[PDB]
Paper text:
Type III secretion systems (T3SS) allow the transport of protein substrates directly across the double membrane of Gram-negative bacteria. Proteomic analyses have identified the major components of the sorting platform for the [name] SPI-1 injectisome: the AAA+ ATPase InvC, its regulator [name] and the proteins [name] and OrgA4. Here we show that a novel, heterotypic interaction between SPOA domains serves as a scaffold for sorting platform assembly in both injectisome and flagellar T3SS. Our structures suggest a partial model for the subtype-specific assembly of the T3SS sorting platforms: the heterotypic interaction between SPOA domains within a given T3SS subtype functions as an adaptor for ATPase and its regulator through interaction with the [name] peptide.
We solublized the pre-coiled-coil region of [name] (residues 1–30) by genetic fusion to T4 [name] and found that it bound to [name] [name],2. Herein, we will refer to the [name],2-binding region at the amino terminus of [name] and its homologues as the adaptor peptide of the ATPase regulator ([name]). The [name],2–[name]([name])::[name] complex was crystalized and its structure solved to 2.0 Å resolution. The [name] [name] forms a lariat-like structure, contacting the thumb of SPOA2 and fingers of [name]. [name] makes substantial contact with both [name] and SPOA2 of [name], burying 570 Å2 against [name] and 470 Å2 against SPOA2. In the [name]-bound structure, there is little change in the conformation of [name] (1.01 Å r.m.s.d.). In the crystal, these residues form the docking site for [name] residues Ile17, Leu18 and Ile19. The [name] surface area buried by these three residues (360 Å2) accounts for approximately one-third of the [name]'s total buried area. To test whether the [name],2–[name] interaction per se is necessary for T3SS function, we constructed an [name] triple mutant (I17D,L18D,I19D) to disrupt its interaction with [name]. As predicted, [name] failed to co-affinity purify [name](I17D,L18D,I19D)–InvC when co-expressed in E. coli, and the aspartate triple mutation completely abolished T3SS in vivo.
Author numbering:
A (entry chain C): 1 to 196
B (entry chain A): 5 to 69
C (entry chain B): 3 to 69
């Protein structure tokens, strides 16, 4: 939903707001604050013309796999089904953000139907929820639910233990750069791996 | 005579502010929302609750008299 | 002393018809964009606006415009 797309300002606790409500701009300049659009754009890229990913299949926008079918037609038939206008394999930026908002919404409602992921998701702050959504983007709901022991350490706020354990994974071995960014996000609960 | 149109405000929250804050508040500042609400207002009259759904807002009550 | 600041997601001028149609759960459409322009109001007067942001233990509005 709309609340999942919000910019997150990862100020630690406690906040010292002026008279309980006002945080000054000068205090906020110290913090690097983004939304999950900006995060998955960094990990997956933003492309407005159909391309083939590393995998390598037909994809579009921010990590949106169209087909595993090698036919550009039908890759175009599902892109077109997705936007609702006849794109000749070419979308706008708005359509990309629309397609992204739909893909995140599907990811979160997937997490919430999963008996393993929901309790962990429910326990996390919004920045670490983004990290969990990131992993669901990369490898699917079922694939993320396979991180049994890390998920349990995340739930118990054993951040350093979870980060050590996530580093022992295939995920980390295969896509180290992105894995390290996501693990940094779990360890610290900030967007700092995304400052570049 | 009668009133034709009614200005509705869909309020998602409020914060009691010490008037001394204005005007220290400026661009780039953050204002915390201390009390989360989801109410339909027409002037000072609370009409009912709404809910933020997929494509917009669904209003529940609207008690108008 | 205290003033009550309201955080207003949306405003609409409505007829009695629109009002009763709304009274029975008819979808009022918002751009998904809507939380990027939350309005800050005090005593029926608009004071400024900004973007809804997520903080760790609460929501807030980052001010884009003020008075």
């Amino acid at each position: 939903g709309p609340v999942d797309m919000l910019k997150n300002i990862p100020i630690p606790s406690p906040l010292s707001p002026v008279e309980g409500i006002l945080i000054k701009r000068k205090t906020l300049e110290r913090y690097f604050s983004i939304n999950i659009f900006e995060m998955l754009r960094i990990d997956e890229g933003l492309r407005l013309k159909i391309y083939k990913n590393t995998e390598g299949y037909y994809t579009i926008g921010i990590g949106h796999l169209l087909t595993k079918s090698p036919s550009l037609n039908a890759a175009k038939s599902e892109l077109d089904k997705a936007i609702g206008r006849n794109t000749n394999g070419v979308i706008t930026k708005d359509e990309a953000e629309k397609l992204f908002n739909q893909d995140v919404d599907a990811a979160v409602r997937g997490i919430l139907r999963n008996a393993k992921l929901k309790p962990v998701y429910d326990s996390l702050d919004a920045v670490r929820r983004a990290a969990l959504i990131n992993m669901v983007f990369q490898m699917g709901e079922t694939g993320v639910a396979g991180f049994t022991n890390s998920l349990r350490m995340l739930q118990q706020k054993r951040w350093d233990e979870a980060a050590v354990n996530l580093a022992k994974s295939r995920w980390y071995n295969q896509t180290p750069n992105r894995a390290k960014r996501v693990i940094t996000t779990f360890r610290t609960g900030t967007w700092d791996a995304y400052a570049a | 005579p009668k009133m034709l149109r009614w200005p509705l405000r869909f309020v998602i929250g409020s914060s009691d502010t010490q008037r001394s804050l204005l005007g220290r508040i400026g661009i780039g500042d953050v204002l915390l929302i201390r009390t989360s609400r989801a109410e339909v207002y027409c002037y000072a009259k609370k009409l009912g609750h709404f809910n933020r759904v997929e494509g917009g807002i669904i209003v529940e009550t609207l008690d108008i008299q | 002393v205290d003033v009550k600041l309201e955080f207003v997601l949306y405003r609409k001028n409505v007829t009695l018809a629109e009002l009763e149609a709304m009274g029975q759960q008819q979808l009022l459409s918002l751009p998904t964009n809507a939380e990027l322009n939350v309005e800050i109001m005090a005593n029926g007067v608009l004071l400024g606006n900004g973007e809804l942001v997520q903080m760790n233990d609460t929501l807030g509005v980052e001010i884009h415009e003020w008075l």
